[PDB]
Tab-separated table of C-alpha atoms and ligand atoms in Angstrom:
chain	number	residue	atom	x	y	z
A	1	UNK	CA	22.416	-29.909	25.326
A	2	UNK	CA	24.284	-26.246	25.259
A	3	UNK	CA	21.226	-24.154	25.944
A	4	UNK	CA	18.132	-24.722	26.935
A	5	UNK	CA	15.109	-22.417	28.688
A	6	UNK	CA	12.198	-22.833	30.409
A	7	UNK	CA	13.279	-26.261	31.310
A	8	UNK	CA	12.555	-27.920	27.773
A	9	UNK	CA	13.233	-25.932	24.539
A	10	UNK	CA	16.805	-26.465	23.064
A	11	UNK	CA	17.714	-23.684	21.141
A	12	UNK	CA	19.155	-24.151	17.930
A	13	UNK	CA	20.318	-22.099	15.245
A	14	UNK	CA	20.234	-18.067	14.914
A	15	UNK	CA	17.124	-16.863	12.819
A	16	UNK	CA	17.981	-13.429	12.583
A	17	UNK	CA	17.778	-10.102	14.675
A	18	UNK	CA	15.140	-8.096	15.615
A	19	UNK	CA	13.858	-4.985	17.390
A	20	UNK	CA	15.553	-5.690	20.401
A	21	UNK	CA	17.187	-8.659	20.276
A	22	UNK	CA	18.303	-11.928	18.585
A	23	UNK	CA	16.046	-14.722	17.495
A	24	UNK	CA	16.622	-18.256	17.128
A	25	UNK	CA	15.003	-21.508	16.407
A	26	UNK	CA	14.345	-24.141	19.027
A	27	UNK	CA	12.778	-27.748	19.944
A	28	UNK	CA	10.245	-28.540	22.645
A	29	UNK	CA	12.292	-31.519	23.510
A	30	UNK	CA	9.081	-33.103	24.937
A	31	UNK	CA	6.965	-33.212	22.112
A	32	UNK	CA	9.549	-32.546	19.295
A	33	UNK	CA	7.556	-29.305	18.119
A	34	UNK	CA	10.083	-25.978	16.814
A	35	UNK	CA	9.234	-22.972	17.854
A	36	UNK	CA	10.983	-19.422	18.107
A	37	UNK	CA	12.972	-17.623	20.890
A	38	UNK	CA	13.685	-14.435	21.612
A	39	UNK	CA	16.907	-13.298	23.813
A	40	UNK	CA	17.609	-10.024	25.266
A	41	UNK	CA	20.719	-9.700	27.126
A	42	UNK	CA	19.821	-8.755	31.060
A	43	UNK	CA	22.192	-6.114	30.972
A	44	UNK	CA	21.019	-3.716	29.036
A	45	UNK	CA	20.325	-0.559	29.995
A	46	UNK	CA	16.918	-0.088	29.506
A	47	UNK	CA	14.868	-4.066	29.099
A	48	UNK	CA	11.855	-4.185	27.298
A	49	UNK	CA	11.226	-7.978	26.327
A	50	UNK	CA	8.616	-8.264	29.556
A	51	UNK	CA	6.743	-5.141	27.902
A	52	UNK	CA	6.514	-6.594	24.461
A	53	UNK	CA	6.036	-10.361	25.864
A	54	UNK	CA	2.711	-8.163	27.973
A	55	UNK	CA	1.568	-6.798	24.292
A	56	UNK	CA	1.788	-10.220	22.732
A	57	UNK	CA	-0.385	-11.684	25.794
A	58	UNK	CA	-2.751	-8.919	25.394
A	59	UNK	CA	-3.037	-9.527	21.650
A	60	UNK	CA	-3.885	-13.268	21.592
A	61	UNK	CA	-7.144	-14.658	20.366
A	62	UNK	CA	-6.176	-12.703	17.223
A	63	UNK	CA	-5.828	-13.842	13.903
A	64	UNK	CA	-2.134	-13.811	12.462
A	65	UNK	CA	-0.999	-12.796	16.118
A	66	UNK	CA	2.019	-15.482	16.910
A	67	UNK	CA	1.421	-17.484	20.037
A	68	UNK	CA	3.702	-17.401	23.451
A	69	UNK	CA	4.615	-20.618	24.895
A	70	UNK	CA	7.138	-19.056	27.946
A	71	UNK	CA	8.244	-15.829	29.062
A	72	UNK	CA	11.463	-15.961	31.633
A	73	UNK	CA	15.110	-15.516	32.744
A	74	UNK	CA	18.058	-18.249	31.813
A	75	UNK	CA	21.301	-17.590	32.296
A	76	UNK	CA	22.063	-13.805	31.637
A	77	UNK	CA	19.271	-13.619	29.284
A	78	UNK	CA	15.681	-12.436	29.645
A	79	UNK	CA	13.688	-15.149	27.219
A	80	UNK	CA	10.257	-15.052	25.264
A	81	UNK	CA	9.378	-18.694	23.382
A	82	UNK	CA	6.118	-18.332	20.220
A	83	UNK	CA	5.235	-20.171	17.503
A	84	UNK	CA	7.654	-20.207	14.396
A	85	UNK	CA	6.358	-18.695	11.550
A	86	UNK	CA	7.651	-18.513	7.980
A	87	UNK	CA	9.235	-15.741	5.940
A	88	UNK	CA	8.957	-12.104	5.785
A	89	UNK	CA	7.131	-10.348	2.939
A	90	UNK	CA	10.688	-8.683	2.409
A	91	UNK	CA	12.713	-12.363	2.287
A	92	UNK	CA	9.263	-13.442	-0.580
A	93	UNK	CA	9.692	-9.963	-2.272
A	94	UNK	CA	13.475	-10.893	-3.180
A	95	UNK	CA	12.650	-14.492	-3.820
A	96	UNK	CA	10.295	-13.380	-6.673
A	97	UNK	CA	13.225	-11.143	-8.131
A	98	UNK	CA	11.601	-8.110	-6.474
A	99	UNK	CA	8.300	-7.779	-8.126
A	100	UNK	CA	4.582	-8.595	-7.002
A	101	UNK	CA	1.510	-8.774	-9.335
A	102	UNK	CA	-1.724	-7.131	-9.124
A	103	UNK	CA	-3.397	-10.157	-7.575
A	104	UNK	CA	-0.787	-10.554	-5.034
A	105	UNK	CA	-0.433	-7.126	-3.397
A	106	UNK	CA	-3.750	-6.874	-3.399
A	107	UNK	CA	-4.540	-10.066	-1.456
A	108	UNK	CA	-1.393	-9.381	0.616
A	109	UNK	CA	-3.771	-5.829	1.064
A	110	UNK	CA	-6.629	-7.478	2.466
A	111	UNK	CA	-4.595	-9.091	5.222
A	112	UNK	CA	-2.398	-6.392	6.396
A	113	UNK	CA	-5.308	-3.854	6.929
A	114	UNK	CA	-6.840	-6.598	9.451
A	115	UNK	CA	-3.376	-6.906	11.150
A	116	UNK	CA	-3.383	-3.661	11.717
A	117	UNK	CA	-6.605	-3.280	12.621
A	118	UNK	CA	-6.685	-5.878	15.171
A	119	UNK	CA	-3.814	-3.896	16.839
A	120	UNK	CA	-5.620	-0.753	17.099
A	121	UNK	CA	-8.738	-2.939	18.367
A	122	UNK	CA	-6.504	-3.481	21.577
A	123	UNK	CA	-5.127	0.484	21.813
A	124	UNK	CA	-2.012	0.466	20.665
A	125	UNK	CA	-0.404	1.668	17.199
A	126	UNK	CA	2.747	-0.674	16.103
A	127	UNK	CA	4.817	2.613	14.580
A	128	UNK	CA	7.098	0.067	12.666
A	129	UNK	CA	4.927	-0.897	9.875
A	130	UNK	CA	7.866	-2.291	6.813
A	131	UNK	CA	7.800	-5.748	4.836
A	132	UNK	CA	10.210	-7.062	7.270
A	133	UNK	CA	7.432	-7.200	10.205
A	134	UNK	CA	4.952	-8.826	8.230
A	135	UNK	CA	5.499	-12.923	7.792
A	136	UNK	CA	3.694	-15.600	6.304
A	137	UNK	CA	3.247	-18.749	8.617
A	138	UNK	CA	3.820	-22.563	8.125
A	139	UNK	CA	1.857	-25.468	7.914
A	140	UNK	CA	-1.721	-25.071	7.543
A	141	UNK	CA	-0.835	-21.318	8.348
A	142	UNK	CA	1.041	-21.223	5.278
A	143	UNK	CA	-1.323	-18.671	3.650
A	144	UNK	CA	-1.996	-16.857	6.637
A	145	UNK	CA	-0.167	-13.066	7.344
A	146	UNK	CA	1.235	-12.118	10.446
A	147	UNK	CA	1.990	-9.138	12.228
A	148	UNK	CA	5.034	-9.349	14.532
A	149	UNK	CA	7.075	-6.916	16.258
A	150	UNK	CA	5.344	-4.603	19.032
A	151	UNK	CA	9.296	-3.410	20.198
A	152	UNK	CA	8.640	0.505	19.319
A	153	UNK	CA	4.816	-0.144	19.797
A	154	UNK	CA	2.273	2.324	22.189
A	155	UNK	CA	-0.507	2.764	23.780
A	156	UNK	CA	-2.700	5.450	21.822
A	157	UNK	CA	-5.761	5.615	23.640
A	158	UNK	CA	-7.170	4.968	27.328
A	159	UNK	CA	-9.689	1.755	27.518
A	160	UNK	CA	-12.200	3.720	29.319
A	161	UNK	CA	-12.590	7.017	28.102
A	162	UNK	CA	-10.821	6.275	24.510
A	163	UNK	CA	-9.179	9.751	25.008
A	164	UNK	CA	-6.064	9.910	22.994
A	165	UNK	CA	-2.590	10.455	24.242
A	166	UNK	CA	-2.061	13.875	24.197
A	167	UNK	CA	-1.507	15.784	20.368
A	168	UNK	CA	2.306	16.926	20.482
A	169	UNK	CA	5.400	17.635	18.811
A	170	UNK	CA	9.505	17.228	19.054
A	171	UNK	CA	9.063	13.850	18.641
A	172	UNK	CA	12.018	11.030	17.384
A	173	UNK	CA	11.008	9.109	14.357
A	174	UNK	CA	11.274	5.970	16.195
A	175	UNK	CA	10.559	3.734	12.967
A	176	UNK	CA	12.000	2.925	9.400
A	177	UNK	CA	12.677	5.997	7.373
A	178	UNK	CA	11.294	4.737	4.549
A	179	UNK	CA	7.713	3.714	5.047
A	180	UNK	CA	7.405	6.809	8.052
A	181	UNK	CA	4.416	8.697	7.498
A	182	UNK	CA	5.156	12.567	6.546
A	183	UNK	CA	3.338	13.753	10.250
A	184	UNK	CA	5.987	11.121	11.947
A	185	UNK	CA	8.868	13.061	10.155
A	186	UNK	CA	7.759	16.472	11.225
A	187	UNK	CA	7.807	14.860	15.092
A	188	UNK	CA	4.086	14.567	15.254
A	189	UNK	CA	2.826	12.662	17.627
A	190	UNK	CA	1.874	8.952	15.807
A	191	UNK	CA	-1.639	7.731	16.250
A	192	UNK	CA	-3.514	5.395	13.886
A	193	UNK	CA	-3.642	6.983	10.670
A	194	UNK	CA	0.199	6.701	10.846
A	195	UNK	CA	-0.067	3.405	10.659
A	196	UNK	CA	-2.057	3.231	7.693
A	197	UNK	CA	-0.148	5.483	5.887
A	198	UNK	CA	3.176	3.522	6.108
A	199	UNK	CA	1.200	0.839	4.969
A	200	UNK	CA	0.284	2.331	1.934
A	201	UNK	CA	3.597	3.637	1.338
A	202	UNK	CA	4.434	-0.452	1.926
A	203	UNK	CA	1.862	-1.214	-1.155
A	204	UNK	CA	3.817	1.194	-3.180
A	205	UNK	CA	6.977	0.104	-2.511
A	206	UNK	CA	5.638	-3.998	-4.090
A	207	UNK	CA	3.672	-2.083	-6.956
A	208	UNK	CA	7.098	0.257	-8.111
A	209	UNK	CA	9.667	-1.860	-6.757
A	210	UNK	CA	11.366	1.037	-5.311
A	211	UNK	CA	9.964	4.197	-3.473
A	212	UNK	CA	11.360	7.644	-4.637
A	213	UNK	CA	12.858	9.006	-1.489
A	214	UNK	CA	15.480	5.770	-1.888
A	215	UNK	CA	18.890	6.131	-2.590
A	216	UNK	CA	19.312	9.100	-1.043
A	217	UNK	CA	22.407	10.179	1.059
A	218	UNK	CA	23.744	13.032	3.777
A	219	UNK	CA	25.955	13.909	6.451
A	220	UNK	CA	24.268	12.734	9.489
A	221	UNK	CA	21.670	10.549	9.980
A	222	UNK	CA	19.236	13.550	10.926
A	223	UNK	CA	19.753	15.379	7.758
A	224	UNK	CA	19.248	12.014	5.332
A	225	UNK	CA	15.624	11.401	7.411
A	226	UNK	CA	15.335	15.436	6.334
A	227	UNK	CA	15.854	14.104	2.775
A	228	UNK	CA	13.754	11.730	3.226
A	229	UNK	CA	11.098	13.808	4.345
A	230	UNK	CA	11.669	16.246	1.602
A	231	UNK	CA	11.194	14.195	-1.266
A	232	UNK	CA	7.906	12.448	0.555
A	233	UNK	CA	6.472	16.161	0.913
A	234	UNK	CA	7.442	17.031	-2.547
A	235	UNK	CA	6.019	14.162	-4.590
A	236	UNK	CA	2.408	14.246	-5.574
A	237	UNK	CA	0.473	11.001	-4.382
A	238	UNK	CA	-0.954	11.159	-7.859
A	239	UNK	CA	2.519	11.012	-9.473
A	240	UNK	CA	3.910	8.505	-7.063
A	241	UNK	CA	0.771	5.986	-8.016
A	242	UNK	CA	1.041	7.162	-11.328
A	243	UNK	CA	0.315	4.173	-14.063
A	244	UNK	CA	-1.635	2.039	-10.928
A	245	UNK	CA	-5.267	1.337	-10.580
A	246	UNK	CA	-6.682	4.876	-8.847
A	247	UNK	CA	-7.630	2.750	-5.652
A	248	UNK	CA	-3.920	3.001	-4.417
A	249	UNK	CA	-4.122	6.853	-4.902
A	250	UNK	CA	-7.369	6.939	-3.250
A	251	UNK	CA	-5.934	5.048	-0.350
A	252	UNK	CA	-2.987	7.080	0.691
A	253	UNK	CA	-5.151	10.420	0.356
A	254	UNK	CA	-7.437	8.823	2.595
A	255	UNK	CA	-5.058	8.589	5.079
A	256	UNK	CA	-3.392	11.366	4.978
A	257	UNK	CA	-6.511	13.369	5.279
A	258	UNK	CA	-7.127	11.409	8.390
A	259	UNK	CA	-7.308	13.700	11.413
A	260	UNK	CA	-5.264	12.495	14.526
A	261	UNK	CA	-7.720	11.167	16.690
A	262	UNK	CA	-10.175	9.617	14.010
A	263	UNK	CA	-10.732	6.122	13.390
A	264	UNK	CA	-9.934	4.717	9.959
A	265	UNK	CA	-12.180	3.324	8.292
A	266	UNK	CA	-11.213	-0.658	7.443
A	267	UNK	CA	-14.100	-1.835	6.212
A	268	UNK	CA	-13.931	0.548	3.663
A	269	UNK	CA	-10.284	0.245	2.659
A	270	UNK	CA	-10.451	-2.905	2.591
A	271	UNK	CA	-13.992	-3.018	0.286
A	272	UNK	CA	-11.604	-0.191	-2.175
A	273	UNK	CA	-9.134	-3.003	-2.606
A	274	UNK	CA	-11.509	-5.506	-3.075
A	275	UNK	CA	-14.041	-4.064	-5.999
A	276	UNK	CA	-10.954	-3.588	-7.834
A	277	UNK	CA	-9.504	-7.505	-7.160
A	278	UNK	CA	-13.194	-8.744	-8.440
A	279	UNK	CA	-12.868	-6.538	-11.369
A	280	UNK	CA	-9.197	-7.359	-12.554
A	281	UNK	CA	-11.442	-11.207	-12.168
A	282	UNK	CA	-8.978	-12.284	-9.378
A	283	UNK	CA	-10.033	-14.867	-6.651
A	284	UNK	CA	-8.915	-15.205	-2.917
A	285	UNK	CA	-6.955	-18.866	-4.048
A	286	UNK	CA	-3.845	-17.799	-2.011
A	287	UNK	CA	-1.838	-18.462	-4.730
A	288	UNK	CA	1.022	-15.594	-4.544
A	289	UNK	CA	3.774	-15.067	-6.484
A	290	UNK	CA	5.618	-17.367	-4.972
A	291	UNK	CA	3.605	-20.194	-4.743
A	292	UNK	CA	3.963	-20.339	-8.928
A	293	UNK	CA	7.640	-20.213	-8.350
A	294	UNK	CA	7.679	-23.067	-5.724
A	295	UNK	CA	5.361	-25.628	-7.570
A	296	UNK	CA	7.202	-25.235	-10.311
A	297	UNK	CA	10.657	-25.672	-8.927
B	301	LCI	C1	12.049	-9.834	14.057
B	301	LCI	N1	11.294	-11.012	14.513
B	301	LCI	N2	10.674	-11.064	15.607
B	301	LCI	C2	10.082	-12.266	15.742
B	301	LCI	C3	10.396	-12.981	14.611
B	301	LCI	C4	9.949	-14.358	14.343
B	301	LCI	N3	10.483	-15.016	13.256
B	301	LCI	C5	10.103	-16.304	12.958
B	301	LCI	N4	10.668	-16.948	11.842
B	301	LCI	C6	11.605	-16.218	10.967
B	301	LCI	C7	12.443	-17.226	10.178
B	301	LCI	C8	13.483	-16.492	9.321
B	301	LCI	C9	12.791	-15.504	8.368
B	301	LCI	N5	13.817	-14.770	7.614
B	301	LCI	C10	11.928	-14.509	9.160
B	301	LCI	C11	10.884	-15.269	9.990
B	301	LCI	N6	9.177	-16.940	13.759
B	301	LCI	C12	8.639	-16.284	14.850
B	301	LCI	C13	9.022	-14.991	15.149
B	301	LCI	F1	8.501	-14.363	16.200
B	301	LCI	C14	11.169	-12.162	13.836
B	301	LCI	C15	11.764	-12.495	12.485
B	301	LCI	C16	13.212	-12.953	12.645
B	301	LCI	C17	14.084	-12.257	11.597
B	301	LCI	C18	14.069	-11.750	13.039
């Protein structure tokens, strides 16, 4: 057929668009499996598919990390082939009319801490931490959360030593706007407490529906993240959790009282989300929001 890669997957379909590049769906034309590729244009000015497609192979063995079949060059494309997974926890957040119960941010929670986690494990930070990069698989994966996108990701510490990139300013918010920690706005240097503060800001976003710093507008794009950065500064955690169970709260002060080089602490985020699931009388069934919707039909 029109286009095929690595000898054997004919790609189908666009997907979507990510970090940098396109995505589309495909067929292993020898086994009749689908999977999803990745093409970045060879000309381009400054090609990073080789270093993400390196990150990936470093990450593997973990759970809710995507699988690469192929890395190569077809045409005037560099190419990267992984497993297909299912939809983003932004495409399920609009599906359900934009609102998440209790049970199922807090089991989405449990899940995205580990992602994260995992990626720290390894010594690098993601810095792009939004529903968009977080998808549920297929198949018996179905009920399993993934972490995908490692574009804008970095090394944060050296293997050996585990002495931290250096502590430094004048830095481009490289991320989303929206769930950016408040140190990332200021041009801090990110390390892994950034991270877990977008996340919370993430949580927030399902609990509210909307974050407070949205809907605002400026001249330049530099003066709206300034907005943005405003109103983040300016609103009490307390106020923007306001009417939530107090472990949300607890969370994001947590984090932000993180110094740069310390390690969060997982186990115990994790065990703050979980008391409280127990309590509410909740059980780890996997049924989310929109698995009512879909077994209804
Ligand atoms: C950004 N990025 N990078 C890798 C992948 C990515 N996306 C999928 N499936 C998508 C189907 C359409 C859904 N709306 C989103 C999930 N499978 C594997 C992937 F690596 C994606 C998600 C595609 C929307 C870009």
């Amino acid at each position: 057929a029109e286009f095929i890669v690595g000898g054997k997957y004919k790609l189908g379909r666009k997907i979507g668009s990510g970090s940098f590049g396109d995505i589309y769906l495909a067929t292993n034309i020898t086994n009749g499996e689908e999977v999803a590729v990745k093409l970045e244009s060879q000309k381009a000015r400054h090609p990073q598919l080789h270093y993400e497609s390196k990150l990936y192979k470093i990450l593997q063995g973990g759970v809710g990390i995507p699988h690469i079949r192929w890395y190569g060059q077809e045409k005037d494309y560099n190419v990267l082939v992984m497993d297909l997974l299912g939809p983003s926890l932004e495409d399920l957040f609009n599906f359900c009319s934009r609102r998440f119960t209790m049970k199922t941010v807090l089991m989405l929670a449990d899940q995205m801490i580990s992602r994260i986690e995992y990626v720290h494990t390894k010594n690098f930070i993601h810095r792009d931490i939004k529903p968009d990069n977080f998808l549920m698989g297929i198949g018996r994966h179905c009920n399993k959360l993934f972490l995908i996108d490692f574009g804008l990701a970095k090394k944060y510490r050296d293997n050996r030593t585990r002495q931290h990139i250096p502590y430094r300013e004048d830095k481009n918010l490289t991320g989303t706007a929206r769930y950016a920690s408040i140190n990332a706005h200021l041009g801090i240097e990110q390390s892994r407490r950034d991270d877990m503060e977008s996340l919370g800001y993430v949580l927030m976003y399902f609990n509210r529906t909307s974050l407070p710093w949205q809907g605002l507008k400026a001249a330049t794009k530099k003066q709206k993240y300034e907005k943005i950065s405003e109103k983040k500064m300016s609103t009490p955690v307390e106020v923007l959790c306001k009417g939530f169970p107090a472990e949300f709260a607890m969370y994001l002060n947590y984090c932000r009282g993180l110094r740069f080089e310390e390690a969060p602490d997982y186990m115990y985020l994790r065990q703050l989300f979980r008391i409280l699931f127990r309590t509410l009388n909740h059980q780890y069934d996997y049924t989310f929001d929109w698995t009512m919707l879909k077994q209804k039909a």
